[PDB]
């Protein structure tokens, strides 16, 4: 019906940090995840108005998308890698929660999540 405001990507009161693990996650996003053929539905907040999904934000109370994550990394919004990993997990589980097994969008999220999990298993030490 109306879209909510998107998740913040900067906040003057939230401590900001650059770490080698967060740099690695930014590289994973820019070099791999953002360019993936299934990235497009996840590159920006779900536009429930344009997609005619009036129930989306009744069901999804913690929205997250890869455009927000990318901007958070680019703005040094995160303090640690775990915060970014959590945002990815929120993004994928939101897709599974709103949709139904076998939906095309769920298959896309599953492939992106599997690739992301591969990259997380190669996360460097701090
Ligand atoms: C996540 C998630 N979790 O749960 C849900 C639900 C979702 C979810 C979220 C978003 C979804 C989404 C699902 N599905 C879509 C669009 C699906 C769609 C709709 C109509 C269509 O074609 C209609 C053809 C005419 N009919 C008579 C058949 C093609 C795809 N979208 C919207 C995708 N939007 C694509 C456009 N983007 C703005 C933009 O300019 N981005 C540039 C990249 O555009 C890309 C990149 C890759 C692939 C496609 C696009 C793109 O615009 N389309 C199509 C083109 C036709 C069209 O009307 N819409 C599209 O999205 C693609 O198939 C904004 C986002």
Curated annotation (Swiss-Prot):
Residues 17-123 form the Bromo domain. Phosphorylation by CK2 disrupt the intramolecular binding between the bromo domain 2 and the NPS region and promotes binding between the NPS and the BID regions, leading to activate the protein and promote binding to acetylated histones. In absence of phosphorylation, BRD4 does not localize to p53/TP53 target gene promoters, phosphorylation promoting recruitment to p53/TP53 target promoters. Ubiquitously expressed. The record marks 99 as: Acetylated histone binding. It comes from the Eukaryota. There is a cross-link at residue 58 (Glycyl lysine isopeptide (Lys-Gly) (interchain with G-Cter in SUMO2)). It is found in: Nucleus; Chromosome. JQ1, a thieno-triazolo-1,4-diazepine derivative, and I-BET, a benzodiazepine derivative, have been tested on tumors with success. Treatment with GSK1210151A (I-BET151, a I-BET derivative) has strong effets on mixed lineage leukemia and promotes myeloid differentiation and leukemia stem-cell depletion. Belongs to the BET family. Chromatin reader protein that recognizes and binds acetylated histones and plays a key role in transmission of epigenetic memory across cell divisions and transcription regulation. Remains associated with acetylated chromatin throughout the entire cell cycle and provides epigenetic memory for postmitotic G1 gene transcription by preserving acetylated chromatin status and maintaining high-order chromatin structure. During interphase, plays a key role in regulating the transcription of signal-inducible genes by associating with the P-TEFb complex and recruiting it to promoters. The NET domain mediates interaction with a number of chromatin proteins involved in transcription regulation (NSD3, JMJD6, CHD4, GLTSCR1 and ATAD5). The C-terminal (CTD) region mediates interaction and recruitment of CDK9 and CCNT1 subunits of the P-TEFb complex. It is also required for maintenance of higher-order chromatin structure. It is linked to Cornelia de Lange syndrome 6: A form of Cornelia de Lange syndrome, a clinically heterogeneous developmental disorder associated with malformations affecting multiple systems. It is characterized by facial dysmorphisms, abnormal hands and feet, growth delay, cognitive retardation, hirsutism, gastroesophageal dysfunction and cardiac, ophthalmologic and genitourinary anomalies. CDLS6 inheritance is autosomal dominant. A chromosomal aberration involving BRD4 is found in a rare, aggressive, and lethal carcinoma arising in midline organs of young people. Translocation t(15;19)(q14;p13) with NUTM1 which produces a BRD4-NUTM1 fusion protein. Interacts with p53/TP53; the interaction is direct. Interacts (via CTD region) with CDK9 and CCNT1, acting as an associated component of P-TEFb complex. Interacts with RELA (when acetylated at 'Lys-310'). Interacts (via NET domain) with NSD3, CHD4, BICRA and ATAD5. The interaction with BICRA bridges BRD4 to the GBAF complex. Interacts (via NET domain) with JMJD6 (via JmjC and N-terminal domains); the interaction is stronger in presence of ssRNA and recruits JMJD6 on distal enhancers. Interacts with NSD3. Interacts with NIPBL. (Microbial infection) Interacts with bovine papillomavirus type 1 regulatory protein E2. This interactions may serve for the tethering of viral genomes to host mitotic chromosomes allowing successful partitioning of the viral genome during cell division. This is Bromodomain-containing protein 4. The chain holds residues 44 to 167 of 1362 of the full protein.
């Amino acid at each position: 019906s109306m879209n909510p405001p998107p998740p913040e990507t900067s906040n003057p009161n939230k401590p900001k940090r650059q770490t080698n693990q967060l740099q690695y996650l930014l590289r994973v996003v820019l070099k791999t995840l953002w360019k993936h053929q299934f990235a497009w539905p996840f590159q920006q907040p779900v536009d429930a108005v344009k997609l005619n999904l009036p129930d989306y934000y009744k069901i999804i109370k913690t929205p997250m998308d890869m455009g927000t994550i990318k901007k958070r990394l680019e703005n040094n919004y995160y303090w640690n890698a775990q915060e970014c990993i959590q945002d990815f997990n929120t993004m994928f589980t939101n897709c599974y929660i709103y949709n139904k097994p076998g939906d095309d969008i769920v298959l896309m999220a599953e492939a992106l999540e599997k690739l992301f999990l591969q990259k997380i298993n190669e996360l460097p030490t701090e």
